[PDB]
Structure 1
């Protein structure tokens, strides 16, 4: 309507004065955006989007025409007016992206695109602009974004689409992203803003395609790079400073699990101080509380901790003792158990473990097979089988040569076997924490006999292989590892 008329007038066009008036209208569009936060023109924002597109076109025309490169007569006015108009338009776009607590998709996308084009033209005709716009975006927040409890960190509209079409494509912005947040964390008010918007950086960092990821390449936004590939060590320094500040400031439970997962998978190749992350991981693994949701960070904590031992040989005292402590039915019911059991494989693949350790672990996992869901059962049958396979000095715990009887013996030995079978007791204690001290070698697996008396045909077939003689060694745990209820449904239907 009126915005479209002003757009047409500015496009047809004292042309500088007319453009300034149009820019004043597009800056009063901030008050219009406040009214949109009240009500987006009967919930539509079509006129607002049209005005934003008009402002973008006008900014493009202004960047093509008026500049501050050459100076002569009235150059101060004729350049500074255009520069201030461009700055005011960029500020209006930033404030529209900033104060919009209301979920305005079209307006937010228009603001993001206008900021993109303005940043490009601003480089080419003037990093500081990025400071201002990341301040606007990190002041943006909504309730659907803040404190994601089920999965994910932040369901922002604006900042997340800013990343999925702006951040993961250009490595030059990526270096000027991390290098500014150090300066932004040196600012106290904006540091407090970051620590309040802690999850926004998690939604920014879960995207796997940072500049340190050498597996793929990224294109370039500005046609002139201001030395964005200066040092990979300085890029990792920016990364690690931002991450140490973030981990020290204002954490929570779901974001703790998320940060620890991304710290296992993506952060360590992008990192530089594994001793700092080592102490952070010792705190994350030794964190023991009565909270039923905070009692399960040891899983990926010990995962990343073992990655850190493999990179550099540190130490964790009573290591397999803490393993025996943490092996819980909560691990049977959480969903990180597949990667935890991969960790359990590279844990128990050592050649210095003994009969007591293996008997304790096989027996505890036998009690968990007595009480565990069946996809977890087809996950953990390989461990019993192949671990009994790699250590055959414990195999007596499946059959006793003195307890098996035969007709070709003396009645004296028959009576001796009868009184010993009456004398037999169960000496295993689940409450002893030392696996070397647990006497799990004398106890067989009637729970594995129950697993032979399971209900599912595939689980019963696996336990019938367990009852059959162990003929082979390679079992392909990766194939027999990741199955679910829905996956078993699809497989049995197929």
Structure 2
């Protein structure tokens, strides 16, 4: 049906020419109606070029299916266009549609959103429309930042298409109706990731997102860890607060969050959350102690981020430095401590960070963590140990670091500087006893049966 393709495009050509030109007009529009049906089939087929013809005929219809100078276009026709392209399983059709016009044209964007409204009001298709919702990313700045229109920049000077608020309104409604419909777990987490960057900036009012977000934030777990981003976005923009923010943060940080994948974003948020200024010392002390105690079991790809942030916080809050260099003031206490060794006054698993006695503890955890196996990590603990020189450490060079980064680092190291080996290697490498060599057996061999 490539000849059918040629017939279709030539029919579009003669159609736009007769529209640019213009008891008979009834059949003259009968032609266009049946051609719309033809184009339904031809998009249900190449369907990308069929889609090109469809936007062309939408253009010609909007241009001259009226007596008025204004360009109304069939929202209904566009609606079934949207219906067929969203039911179609062709990712390439959807991509060409999104990139070519939705990421290009604002008339398309707005009327697209409302077409989505109508169509959703009347699962895999849910995934498709969700993909499209995610595919719209960029929020324009202003009504003069709209500044490009597929058809008919309106001379209304008050038009909904001229007012950014309406496009934000329509996309807002789209997201509202979609979450009102319901969505999957994976859809939920993808939203919760990309929201504050690309979904929360779409709302004329994000307060229902404040609702939904603090619900999944009070839910708990990795979803709530993702929810932190959104709730911070909202408390920053429109100061609708959570009740107990810092105590929530303190108990929120837990065992596995360092092992979570999104700790990078998490740490940038926490960098703000202690970049605040109205913070009491014992609160930031609590966060210090808890983070050291979790660093005792952390991955090193986290510890590399963990340490320089402490250098920062120590630089800002000198009433934390007492956990680094702590003198017994009194000889009486010196007697008491040399007699009875020290117990940690800090309370693990205490809820309120403003009451955990992190003050009067020490960073035994990190000074033991100096004796890590990994050398760069050990040096970074030495940075705490050594002296206070640099005014700050950025973390941006530290973030997003993984075992992958460490392995490619050692890989991209030189092929070989001439290395060293171990001399006088014993022969009884798998021998169980060797009672005649007097060298004690490999612990692995003693605890492993090889036979």
Report TM bin, short chain.
Answer: 0.7 to 0.9
Whole-Å separation in 2 of the counterparts to 1:195 and 1:213: 35
For residues 355 and 452 of structure 1, do their structure 2 counterparts lie closer, same or farther at Cα, with a shift above 3 Å needed? same
For residues 214 and 349 of structure 1, do their structure 2 counterparts lie closer, same or farther at Cα, with a shift above 3 Å needed? farther
1:121 is aligned to 60
For residues 63 and 445 of structure 1, do their structure 2 counterparts lie closer, same or farther at Cα, with a shift above 3 Å needed? same
- Give per-residue Cα distances to partners, 1:413-465, cap 9 Å, x unaligned: 865442142xx323433222222232333432222023211222221221111
Whole-Å separation in 2 of the counterparts to 1:238 and 1:376: 42
3-state DSSP of counterpart to 1:393:
helix
Q: Tell me if the contact between 1:240 and 1:271 (Cα under 8 Å) persists in the aligned partners.
A: yes
For residues 318 and 63 of structure 1, do their structure 2 counterparts lie closer, same or farther at Cα, with a shift above 3 Å needed? closer
Q: Tell me if the contact between 2:102 and 2:136 (Cα under 8 Å) persists in the aligned partners.
A: no
2:37 is aligned to 88
Whole-Å separation in 2 of the counterparts to 1:136 and 1:58: 21
Whole-Å separation in 2 of the counterparts to 1:361 and 1:132: 55
Match of 1:333 among 259, 264, 271: 259
Q: Tell me if the contact between 1:195 and 1:249 (Cα under 8 Å) persists in the aligned partners.
A: no
Are positions 1:270 and 2:202 aligned together? yes
Superposition deviation, residue 218 in structure 1:
6.8
The runs of 5 or more residues in structure 2 that have no matched partner are 66-74, 414-451
Are positions 1:459 and 2:377 aligned together? yes
Match of 2:166 among 224, 227, 234: 234
Equivalent runs, 1:71-110 vs 2, <5 Å: 75-76=24-25, 78-94=27-43, 96=44, 107-110=46-49
TM-score normalised by length of structure 2: 0.79
1:200 is aligned to 129
1:167 is aligned to 102
1:177 is aligned to 112
Whole-Å separation in 2 of the counterparts to 1:205 and 1:284: 20
1:5 is aligned to none
For residues 366 and 375 of structure 1, do their structure 2 counterparts lie closer, same or farther at Cα, with a shift above 3 Å needed? same
Q: Tell me if the contact between 2:139 and 2:198 (Cα under 8 Å) persists in the aligned partners.
A: no
3-state DSSP of counterpart to 1:197:
helix
Q: Tell me if the contact between 1:195 and 1:250 (Cα under 8 Å) persists in the aligned partners.
A: no
1:430 is aligned to 348
Whole-Å separation in 1 of the counterparts to 2:376 and 2:30: 77
Superposition deviation, residue 212 in structure 1:
5.2
Superposition deviation, residue 219 in structure 1:
4.5
3-state DSSP of counterpart to 2:287:
helix
Are positions 1:396 and 2:314 aligned together? no
Report runs of 4+ in structure 1 exceeding 6 Å deviation: 213-218
Superposition deviation, residue 487 in structure 1:
3.2
Superposition deviation, residue 88 in structure 1:
2.4
Superposition deviation, residue 467 in structure 1:
0.4
Superposition deviation, residue 56 in structure 1:
1.8
Whole-Å separation in 1 of the counterparts to 2:163 and 2:334: 80
- Give per-residue Cα distances to partners, 1:243-286, cap 9 Å, x unaligned: 11112221221111221233211233321113222222221211
Q: Tell me if the contact between 2:98 and 2:135 (Cα under 8 Å) persists in the aligned partners.
A: no
Instruction: Report how many aligned residue pairs link the two structures.
Output: 400
Match of 2:367 among 449, 454, 461: 449
The runs of 5 or more residues in structure 1 that have no matched partner are 1-47, 98-106, 143-155, 185-189, 289-294
Whole-Å separation in 2 of the counterparts to 1:214 and 1:297: 35
For residues 280 and 448 of structure 1, do their structure 2 counterparts lie closer, same or farther at Cα, with a shift above 3 Å needed? same
